[PDB]
Structure formats: C-alpha cells, structure tokens
Write a protein that binds this ligand. Structure first.
Ligand SMILES: Cc1cc2nc3c(=O)[nH]c(=O)nc-3n(C[C@H](O)[C@H](O)[C@H](O)COP(=O)(O)OP(=O)(O)OC[C@H]3O[C@@H](n4cnc5c(N)ncnc54)[C@H](O)[C@@H]3O)c2cc1C
Ligand SMILES: NC(=O)c1ccc[n+]([C@@H]2O[C@H](COP(=O)([O-])OP(=O)(O)OC[C@H]3O[C@@H](n4cnc5c(N)ncnc54)[C@H](O)[C@@H]3O)[C@@H](O)[C@H]2O)c1
Ligand SMILES: O=C(O)[C@@H]1C[C@@H](O)CN1
Ligand SMILES: [Mg+2]
Length: 1218
C-alpha cells in the first residue's frame, strides 16, 4: 500500500533559484511590486520629452486619418437604432451560413426582404448578439434580448427592405472575412499578407484554437497547426525567422487537461506534440510562438519552454518564441528566468511582451478561490509601468533574446522606441500589433520614412465559427474604457492625456502601487459584514510543497471519535475508520454511542440549556468566530482528514473547510444583526448530518443551533465520524462548553434515539428523503411542553436537471456538466443528475461530453492528479451499479470510463453517462457519478420544465442559454430552490447562494440564508433586509370581503398580514465580480388549512394569502358556511379537501386546535404522501392573543439564483474599472 500523500503533487523538476523567485511574486501585494518597476522604467528628462513628442506625432496622425467605421456608416445611412444595427448583423451572420451565394441572394430577394424572416432562418438568429452588440455599440451585454432584436429586425426590414439587408450582408462578409481574421484559411491569409510584407511588416499567424475539451479536439488543433506550419514555411521560402512569417500556438489547444494538476500528463503527452511542431518550424526556419493564457498556466508552461530549449534535436534554430504578460506580477521574474534559459541553452528566445488578455477573468477567479491577492495588477497604469520596466530589462539582453513589443498604445511604443536608442538592425528587436487593429499606428512606424522599425502582425486565421468563439475577449483588449484604442477614438480625451507618462504619474501618487479602490480583495468580498474564508492556490509550488508535508503529517495522526457527553467521553463499541479509496488505509477509530448514552446526553443537554441560553448572543457569536479562525488555521490538516476519511479531492476538501468557516462567520454575523432577549431558544436540538459534507453541513447545523442559544446533540454520519469529532474539538476550544455541544457517533439508531428522546426540542436533519420521512413520523406523536409541534428542518435529496439550448457554447456546457455531475463522484446533493439537450445540438454536445468523460482520472484522492474519488461504501457502490445495469438491461446507451486496477482496494464507480428516452425513466435519486441525458425539441421546452418539476424534487437547477426570453420562461416556470444560469450547479456559497430546495428536497428554511436562525428560537426575529413593499392582491380582496361580512377584526388582521408578508422580496447579495447572485421570496404553493373555528379559519386564510399561497381547507372542519360568496379572485385560490392525500402535494400547513387535536392532525399530515410539510399550529386562544400565532417566515419560499454574467467572454462592469 502506497504511503498517504507520498506522491501528492511532486513538481516537474526541482525549482531553481530563478523559478522560486517567480513563484514568490505570484500574489505579491501591489504596493510591493510597483517601486522596483518604477525604478527600472525611469528614463531621462530628455528622453521623456522626446518620447512625448513622438507619441503626440503618432496620435495626431492616427486621429487625422481616422474615418467612420463601416458599421457606423451603415447605422447612419439607414437611421438604425442600436438594436436594429445588432439585429441586422445577426441576420447577416445567419445569411452567411448559407454557403452558396446564389441561394443566399435568392433567399434575401424573394423571402427575407418580402416579410417574414422567421419562416426561413432551431438556432436563434441572435446567438452571437452579445458580440455584435460590442461591434455596434462598444458595450458588452452579457445575455441577448432576443425579443427586442426580433422586433428590431422586423421593423428595419419592413422599413428599409432588401437594400439594408444587402448592405448588412456585405459588411458582415468583409468584417468576418478580412477584419476579424486575415483570411478564412492559412492559404488565404498568406495571399493577403504580401501587400504589407512588401512595406516591411511581418506576420505571425494565430490559428484561433484554444481550450481543447477532448482528445479528438486536441488532435484536430494539432493537425491544424501542422498544416499551417507547412503553408507558412513554404511561403517563408528561406526568409528566416525575422523577415519571414511564423506561427503562434496555444498550449491549451494541444491537450484537454492542460493544468498543473495534470502536470505529468502535460509533460508526457503535450510536450512531445509541441516538440514535433517545433521540429517542423525548425526545418522551415520560421518562428513558433507559445501564446500566454491564464495565470495558473504560466509556470507550468515554463517547464515546457525549458525542455524544448535544452532539447538537442531543436538546436540550430532560434525561432522558438514565448509570450510574457506585463499585467502579471511575476513578469520581470519570468523574464529573468527566460533570459537565463536563453543564455544556458544558446537559443535566442523570441520574447513577445504583451500586457495581457484575461484581466477580468483573473479578478473573478481569485475572488472565487479566496486567495491572498490577485496575480495581476488592478490599476491599468500599473500594467503600463510594468510593461515599460520589463521592456528595459529586455532591451539590455538583445544579444541573448529577441524582444517583441506587442502594443497598440502609442505612448508605450514611443517610450520604448526612444529607450532602445539609435543603434538598430533587423533582428535586434521588433514591435507587434494585431491584424485589423494596429496597422494605422504602425504604418506611422514601419519604413524608412517613418521610424524605420519593423512590426509583426498577429494575424487570426479561421472560419466564422472559429473567430466568433472568443471574439468578445479580443474586442475587450482594445475596447474597454481604459484601452488606448478606445480612448484615441474618444474626442473628450486630449492628446496631452494620451501622452501622459505612466511612470511619472505612478511615481507621484500618494501610495505608490495601491490596489484599485473599486476591486475587493477576496478576503474583503463581504466588506464589514464578515471576513471571507481563505482558500489555497494549488498552482503555487510553495503551497503544494507546504501542503504535501501537512497532508503527510495529518495521515500519521491517530484520529479518534468518541461519545463526548457533557460529563466526559463515554465507553462504547470501537471500530476502525477506513479510507474509501483504499480499505488498507486505516484513518482512525470511532467509539460509537449506546442508545442509553444518547438518551442520557439529551437529559444532560436539557439540564444545561439555561446556562447556555444565558450566554449573551454576541458572546455565542464570538465563539463561532473563534472557531472559524481555528478552522482557517488548521485547514491543511483538516484537508488531509477529509481527503482520506470521505474520499474527497484536495480541491473539494478546501471548498468543504471554506464552507464550514463561512457558516460559522455567517451565522455569527446574522446573530449580531438579530438575536435579543425575546428570541428564546427552543432547547436541546438534535443535529443529524450526512456523510458527503462531513465538516461543512455538520458544522453549519450545529453552529446555527448553538448560536441561537440551544444546546446541541451532534450525531454525525456513521461513515465520517473523525472529521466531525475534530469539528467538535475546535468548537469546544473556541469556547462552546462541553454541556452545550455533545458528540454522539454512531449509526441511524443513535440518530433515532436522540430524535425520540423526551427533552428533544428541535431536529435539524440533512440526508435522504426516506430517513427524513421516518424522523417526521417520529416527531408526529410529539409536542413541546407548550403543546406545539417540535420544529424539524429536513434538507433532503435532489433530482437536479440542467437545460441547454442551441445558443449555449458547447465547451462551456461540457465543462460545467463534467464538474456538476462527477465532482465528488456525484456525491453532492446539488449534483447534476439529468442533462437536457436541445435536439439540434444534442449529438455534438454528447460527443464532446463523452470525450471529456474519458479524460477524468479516478483513484485514491491523496494525489493532486485525481479528479474523481471513490464512493463512500460498498453498499453505495452496489446500489449505484444496480441502477446502471438496470438501465443497460433496458437497452439504454451507457458510457463509462475504464477504471485502473488500483481502484480494486477501495469502492469506486466509474463516471457514467446514460442516455434516457424520457425523464420518467428515472425513479429515485441515484447518489453517484451517473449523468442521465435526455433530448428535447425546442417547442417542447415548456413541457420539459413540467417533466423536471414532475419528479417532486426541487433542489438545484441549471440553464445554459444566451436568450433572455428563454431565461425568463424557464426560471419563472421551474420550481427549485437554487437556480444557476450559464455556470455549474454545485458549490453554493454561504450568504451568496443560500442553499436549500422545496418539495421532496426540503422543508427550508435555507442553510446559509437569513431565515435559518429564526427557526431555532421560539419567537423569530426580523431578518436583515427582510421586508416587502408589495401586497398580495388576493389578500386585499379577502380583507375587503371580510369587512363586507362584518368581520372587522379579522379584516384588520388580514391587512396586517398583507403588510407584514415579505412576499416579493428581491435582493442582490454581495459576491464575486462577474456573477449576479439574487435572493427572492415567493409563495410556497398550496397550504393545507386545518381550522377549528370561523375566526381561526379567517386568520389562517389571511396568513396564507398574504404570502401568495393557495389553500386547501379541511372539509371535515364543517366551516364551509363561513366562506360563502367569496370574490372570484379568492375563490380561485381556495379549495376544500375531504381526502388530503388526494389533493396534494402541499407546501405547508396551518393547524388550529387544542394540544390533542394538533397531535392528531400532525399524525395525519405526516402520513400524506410526498414532501415533508412545514406545519404550524396554534390554539384558538393563541390566534386571538398573538398576531404572529402563525409566522409568515415559513409561508414563503426562498429562491436563490446565480447568473454568470461573464459567460459571454468578458465582464461589462469591469470594462469601466481601470
Ligand atoms: C501581437 C499581439 C500578441 C498578443 N499576444 C497575447 C497573448 O499570447 N497572451 C495575452 O494574454 N494577450 C496577448 N495580446 C493582447 C495584449 O496582451 C493586450 O491585451 C492588448 O493587445 C491590449 O494592450 P495594449 O498595449 O494594446 O493597449 P492598452 O490600452 O495600452 O492596454 C490595455 C491592457 O491594459 C490591461 N489592463 C486594463 N485594465 C487594467 C486594470 N484595471 N488593471 C491592470 N491592468 C489592466 C490589460 O492587459 C489590457 O488588455 C497580444 C496582443 C498583440 C497586439
Ligand atoms: N438538501 C441538502 O442540503 C443535502 C445536503 C447533503 C446531502 N443531502 C442528501 O443526503 C443523502 C446522502 O447523505 P447520507 O447518505 O448521509 O443520508 P442518510 O439519510 O443515509 O443519513 C443521514 C444521517 O441520518 C442518520 N440516520 C439514518 N437513519 C436514521 C433514522 N432512522 N433516524 C435518525 N437518523 C437516521 C444517519 O446516521 C446520518 O447521520 C442524499 O439523499 C443527499 O441528497 C441533502
Ligand atoms: O452546493 C453545494 O454543493 C454545497 C452543499 C451544500 O452545503 C451547499 N453547498
Ligand atoms: Mg445512510
């Protein structure tokens, strides 16, 4: 048996002094990066004056030849609105998908121009409207208002006819064939390059591949590069690497798992492919440049650059090139490494200095990951100073490297032109620019009549489909408010402003290098409310080295879990806890609780309840905050335990510990916002938790109950007692008294013994719906000492769907599907179970999905390279496999990864894709790595949403579409608690996506949300921000009816319920950039009313209607005559039920009666099929005395919606931040 973590994440090679200096700068504070860059970028006053003069001359030339764009002239000629211009370009794009010119022209003339375009053109015309919106308006709108565009297109065609369609088609043809690309094919691009090569320009061709999803994709990009190198080398015809053309490649195009976590596969499989392309470039003697991509790929790419430059088979050729990004904090240290590598190898490395193309994505990623700082600067001027400083370094090393200064900024250009001084020869250095963007500037640079410096044009090559895929990211490079190209086109920007010297501006700032004011550090995402949890950068070699040792040390510890009663640990039956990925690996030992001691623990909790309730709320919250600090400090050790006990990967263990820290801090802050003397605790609360989030959900339930003033009996899942015991140790260290928090390890009958104990005042359950139903039945024969039902929070299973239409980007979909379905071996309650693909795109996405499936690494999770770990037990494995084989036996197509022999020592299920005929083929939640796929016709979308709802579950739900009409339709009709738009459906974040479902998926209130603590006290406080100015109109009609009947007091109570209801609350919660996180209060559905008196019925109806609900009223109440002559609006919401089980499912219940009536009704309600119902009961006298006898918190339904607003390829809000 391999030693735990002995091979967790060894680096590709020992890290040199130069490599370590790179890693040390990864997230260095911005104030620390800038001073040395200012120093390096400083130039003489004479040079600065000369540079400003040169920059002014260039800018005066640029503004002097600047004409209106073709799209602007089109909009002007036909008086188009912005939406019409966008709609026109989308139509033109669609018409150009018709390959035959005569056919297209006939369609335009005979069909498109003469009325209905809809009849003639499965795929919305407006799939790429966000891109065309950037072209027309200069502004990025993340999703497409396709109803507005359809109206605009009808309007413009009916107004202007064939001539405007013709002009749009010709414009789009020119832009997509000659501007966004140099040519559709490498041969076409080469033909069109002669003109500017004759003027002194050169070329590097960008074949536009990136982000391979499958082996087949990577092979396709490889053969595309190979064929392009032949065409370029044939055309180069011996011109060499400086005068002649070259190619640029992206390493992410050449392997589907290009990442540090897969470093071994990258060096074994990706590196030989790059070497083969480099060998071909060497034979033709052309440049081959490695483009720079995301920050977490920088250092990995250095290992490829190193091997290639040391490889003797490539000797004699100086064409190997490499991009470094000046917006990155590591840039000068990366250059030091490259310059030294060039010296050692004797290869004159071609170094393209750029600023960087992924800025807004890097901001979002660091925030999501809770990392210490950003790997890029946050003020644009800092990137400018960094660029100039790094140019000074490169210009001092032209004997060993070939600097290539890629920029469209005339100030940057001028500064470097004068920095380089008087001596020049071709081959010393060059400038670079983008095709269709930089030529106006560089036609003032190239040539003996200008500055006589060469410029290499980066020339995209590809079809319409290929160029549109990431055109948004390219547009933002030069189209943001801080971009030079955007500013030179802004008449409100003066030339004096444009020639401002970034070096001297930064030098004169009060705090040199300060972070941008409007960008939050990840730790400060929530501002004054609470401190964000911190993650770990698994791309950072120092972090991986430190984590390796902490994880190894964690595996040497003798972890135990004992029954920790108030009086001390108790004796019991002891057994080992085994690693689910390798049963030979003993993680620790658990002593499980006898049923006698579980009953004893509840009595001790009851005796201790007054002492814990008397700890003031702020001090209880301080315990939670101290516990969060302790978990943050101990995260590395906690990771190792979760990895080995629960079969989790390192990434998932980090997220798990982060969620625990976030629960502690969120419930502490919510406590400080709400809890006072009148919010009395329930009493002893039994917290029963599942194995699959063995620290986060465990901690969340306990922390909430404790901080609300309740002593807790913690019963962790039998599979995962060790991390639970450590959580309890931490909470006790943080100041939770032993009498307030008792740990009772064991199985379901320890849980049941706790639930059944006479002093149990509340139950918090997360687990399967079947077990929650058994707990519900147990509690149905129970009343509190005050004669009211024992509160139960029961958060249960899901049958989670994702709907994908033909507007979604397949690569994005597949990544989100692979993550949502197979992360944690599908053992998240949020996991994607049913993928629903629009028929027109289903086969293409399915092929990509299966290809991505086979790139997953399954194994014991103490290796960073493992993507999917084991299932938790052999019983879980057998249950999942039985489902798979049943499906296979029915003839359903089944796709499965092959498992390595090493998995035999643990319990593994291979990630599996099962193609279903209809959603009804699924009967129960299958809690494993099993994705089901169904197909749907676009016209049947509404029926499909019905089918998803018809399972009765309602936990997580995903939608991939660009189309506002589809977003509005689907999100209004789906019934689920957590919605996700254009992103994955897992990893809901505390206080950002409050988590919890409806129907068979939960009772609520949501964990990680503002209603949670109020369920754990006898009188609920008013949550922060919890109110609504909207009044339900049926409630109003009912109040008027009551006044008409003479029931004046009930009418007043109804109006009060209408005002007090928070139905219609609609909030945006603070979170990361590039995401909109929404929280809304809706009706629950149909509420079962069990009244006893006429006044009681009126109060129950007022409560239910004020919260937007319909009702079913118990016909056995005999109160039919109390509701005569209702207004039709109210009658529509009212039904009478003799057979409650026939008229469900309900979403809650209100009960009136004495204690034994309540107990009887509670038993009958628990026996209803389907969802657990959140029941509220009151006596007739309570209804008369207490306006809040029925609490309106529990009659609304919380919905969380998380929208990825960066999905179109950039962040509109961050285009204004520089
Ligand atoms: C020939 C060529 C090759 C290129 N190759 C690559 C490549 O392989 N990898 C790559 O990542 N990109 C590449 N780029 C893009 C380049 O990195 C820039 O994104 C783009 O060209 C605009 O920079 P600029 O000097 O032209 O103009 P500018 O307007 O001077 O600079 C714009 C840049 O400033 C930076 N910036 C904007 N806002 C902020 C902020 N708030 N904080 C910090 N920095 C900010 C961004 O990097 C932005 O792109 C290439 C560009 C060219 C012309
Ligand atoms: N909605 C959510 O937030 C959420 C979160 C995570 C998991 N889940 C659900 O949890 C399920 C998987 O987790 P699990 O396998 O640990 O669930 P489970 O139902 O098998 O057990 C959960 C806990 O209940 C206890 N238990 C079993 N029988 C009991 C009984 N008769 N009385 C009292 N307690 C009893 C168990 O010991 C365990 O601590 C899945 O259905 C998943 O969807 C839901
Ligand atoms: O959404 C998810 O996957 C996790 C599980 C719940 O605790 C909420 N956060
Ligand atoms: Mg179980």
């Amino acid at each position: 048996a391999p030693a735990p973590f002995a091979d967790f994440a060894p680096p590709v090679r020992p890290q040199s002094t130069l490599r370590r200096a790179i890693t040390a700068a990864y997230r260095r504070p911005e104030t620390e990066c800038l001073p040395p860059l200012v120093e390096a970028a400083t130039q003489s006053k004479e040079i600065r004056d000369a540079a400003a003069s040169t920059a002014r001359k260039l800018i005066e030339a640029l503004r002097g030849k600047h004409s209106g764009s073709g799209v602007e002239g089109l909009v002007q000629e036909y008086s188009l609105s912005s939406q019409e211009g966008v709609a026109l370009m989308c139509l033109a794009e669609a018409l150009l998908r018709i390959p035959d010119t005569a056919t297209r022209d006939a369609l335009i003339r005979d069909k498109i121009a003469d009325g209905n375009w809809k009849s003639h053109l499965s795929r919305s015309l407006f799939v790429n409207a966000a891109t065309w919106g950037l072209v027309v308006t200069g502004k990025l709108t993340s999703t497409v208002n396709d109803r507005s565009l359809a109206a605009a297109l009808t309007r413009l065609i009916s107004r202007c006819g064939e001539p405007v369609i013709r002009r749009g088609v010709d414009m789009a043809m020119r832009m997509m064939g000659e501007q966004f690309v140099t040519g559709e094919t490498i041969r076409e691009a080469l033909k069109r390059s002669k003109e500017l090569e004759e003027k002194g320009f050169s070329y590097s061709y960008d074949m536009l591949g990136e982000a391979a999803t499958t082996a087949a994709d990577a092979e396709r990009y490889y053969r595309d590069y190979e064929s392009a190198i032949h065409a370029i080398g044939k055309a180069s015809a011996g011109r060499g690497i400086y005068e002649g053309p070259g190619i640029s490649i992206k390493l992410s195009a050449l392997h589907p798992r290009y990442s540090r976590a897969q470093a071994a596969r990258v060096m074994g499989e990706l590196l030989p492919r790059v070497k083969a392309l480099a060998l071909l470039a060497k034979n033709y003697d052309i440049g081959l440049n490695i483009d720079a991509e995301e920050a977490d790929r920088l250092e990995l790419s250095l290992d490829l650059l190193e091997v290639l430059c040391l490889d003797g088979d490539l000797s004699g050729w100086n064409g190997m090139g490499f991009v470094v990004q000046a917006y990155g904090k590591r840039c000068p240290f990366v250059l030091d490494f490259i310059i030294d590598l060039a010296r050692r190898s004797g290869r004159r490395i071609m170094v393209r200095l750029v600023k960087g193309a992924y800025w807004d994505a890097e901001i979002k990623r660091a925030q999501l990951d809770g990392l210490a700082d950003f790997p890029v600067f946050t003020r644009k001027i800092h990137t400018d100073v960094s660029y100039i400083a790094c140019a000074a370094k490169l210009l001092a090393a032209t004997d060993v490297v070939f600097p290539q200064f890629a920029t469209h900024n005339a100030q940057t250009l001028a500064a470097i032109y004068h920095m380089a001084g008087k001596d020049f020869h071709v081959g010393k250095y060059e400038f670079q620019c983008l095709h269709g963007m930089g030529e106006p500037l560089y036609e003032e640079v190239v040539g003996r009549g200008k500055l006589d410096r060469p410029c290499r044009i980066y020339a995209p090559v590809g079809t319409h489909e290929t160029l549109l895929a990431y055109l948004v990211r390219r547009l933002l490079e030069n189209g943001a408010n801080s971009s030079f190209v955007h500013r030179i086109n802004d008449p409100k920007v003066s030339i004096d402003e444009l020639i401002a010297d970034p070096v001297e501006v930064v030098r004169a700032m009060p705090v040199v290098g300060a972070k941008h004011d409007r960008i939050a550090l990840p730790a400060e995402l929530f501002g004054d409310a609470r401190t964000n949890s911190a993650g770990l950068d698994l791309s950072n070699e120092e972090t991986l080295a430190s984590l390796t040792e902490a994880l190894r040390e964690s595996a040497a510890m003798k972890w135990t879990a004992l029954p920790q009663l108030a009086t001390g640990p108790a004796a019991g039956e002891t057994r080992t806890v085994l690693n689910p990925g390798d049963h030979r690996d003993v993680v620790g030992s658990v002593t499980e609780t006898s049923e006698e001691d579980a009953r004893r623990a509840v009595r001790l909790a009851a005796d201790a309840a007054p002492d814990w309730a008397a700890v003031p709320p702020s001090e209880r919250a301080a315990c939670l905050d101290r516990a969060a600090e302790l978990m943050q400090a101990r995260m590395p050790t906690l990771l190792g335990l979760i990895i080995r006990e629960a079969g989790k990967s390192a990434l998932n263990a980090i997220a798990e510990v982060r969620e625990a820290i976030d629960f502690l801090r969120y419930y502490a802050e919510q406590t400080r916002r709400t809890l006072g003397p009148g919010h009395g605790p329930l009493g002893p609360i039994v917290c029963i938790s599942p194995w699959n989030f063995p620290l986060a959900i465990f901690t969340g339930q306990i922390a909430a109950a404790l901080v609300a003033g309740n002593p807790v009996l913690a019963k962790p899942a039998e599979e995962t007692p060790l991390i639970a015991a450590e959580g309890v140790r931490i909470l006790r260290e943080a100041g939770i008294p032993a009498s307030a928090l008792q740990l009772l390890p064991g199985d379901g009958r320890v849980g049941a013994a706790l639930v059944a104990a006479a002093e149990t005042a509340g139950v918090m359950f997360t687990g399967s719906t079947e077990v929650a139903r058994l707990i519900q039945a147990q509690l149905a024969d129970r009343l509190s000492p005050a004669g009211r039902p024992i509160p139960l929070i029961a958060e249960t299973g899901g049958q989670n769907a994702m709907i994908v239409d033909s507007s979604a980007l397949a690569e994005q979909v597949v990544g989100d599907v692979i993550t949502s379905a197979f992360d944690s071996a599908g053992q998240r309650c949020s996991a994607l179970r049913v993928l629903c693909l629009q028929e027109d795109v289903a086969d293409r996405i399915l092929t990509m999905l299966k290809g991505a499936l086979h790139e997953l690494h399954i194994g014991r999770t103490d290796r960073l390279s493992v993507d999917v770990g084991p299932v938790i037990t052999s019983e879980a494995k057998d249950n999942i496999e039985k489902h798979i084989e049943r499906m296979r036996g029915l003839g359903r197509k089944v796709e499965q990864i092959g498992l390595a022999s090493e998995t035999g020592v643990g319990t593994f299920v291979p990630p599996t894709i099962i193609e279903l005929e209809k959603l009804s083929d699924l009967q129960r939640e299958v809690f494993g790595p099993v994705l089901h796929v169904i197909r749907y016709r676009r016209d049947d979308l509404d029926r499909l949403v019905d089918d998803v709802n018809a399972t009765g579950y309602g936990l997580t739900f995903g939608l991939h579409t660009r189309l506002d009409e589809t977003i509005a339709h689907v999100t209004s009709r789906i019934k689920a608690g957590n919605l996700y738009i254009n992103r994955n459906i897992i990893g809901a974040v505390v206080g950002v996506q409050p988590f919890g479902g409806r129907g068979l998926s939960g009772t609520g209130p949501k964990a990680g949300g503002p209603l949670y603590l109020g369920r754990l006290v006898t009188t609920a406080p008013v949550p922060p921000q919890h109110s609504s100015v909207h009044t339900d109109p049926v409630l109003l009609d009912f109040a008027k009816w009551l006044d008409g009947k003479g029931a004046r007091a009930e009418a007043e109570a109804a109006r009060n319920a209408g005002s007090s209801s928070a139905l219609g609350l609609d909030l945006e919660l603070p979170g990361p950039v590039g995401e909109r996180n929404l929280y809304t209060l809706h009706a629950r559905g149909r509420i079962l009313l069990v009244p006893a008196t006429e006044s009681g019925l009126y109060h129950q109806l007022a409560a239910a209607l004020a919260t937007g609900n319909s009702v079913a009223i118990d016909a056995a109440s005999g109160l039919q005559a109390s509701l005569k002559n209702l207004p039709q609006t109210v009658g529509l919401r009212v039904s009478w039920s003799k057979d409650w089980a026939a008229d469900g499912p309900f979403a809650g219940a209100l009960v009136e009666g004495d204690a034994e009536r309540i107990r009887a009704v509670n038993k009958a309600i628990a026996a209803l099929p389907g969802p657990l119902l959140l029941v509220q009961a009151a006596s007739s006298g309570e209804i008369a005395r207490n306006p809040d006898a029925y609490c309106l918190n529990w009659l609304v339904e919380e919905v969380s919606a998380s929208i990825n607003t960066a999905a179109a390829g950039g962040n509109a809000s961050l285009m204004a931040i520089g």
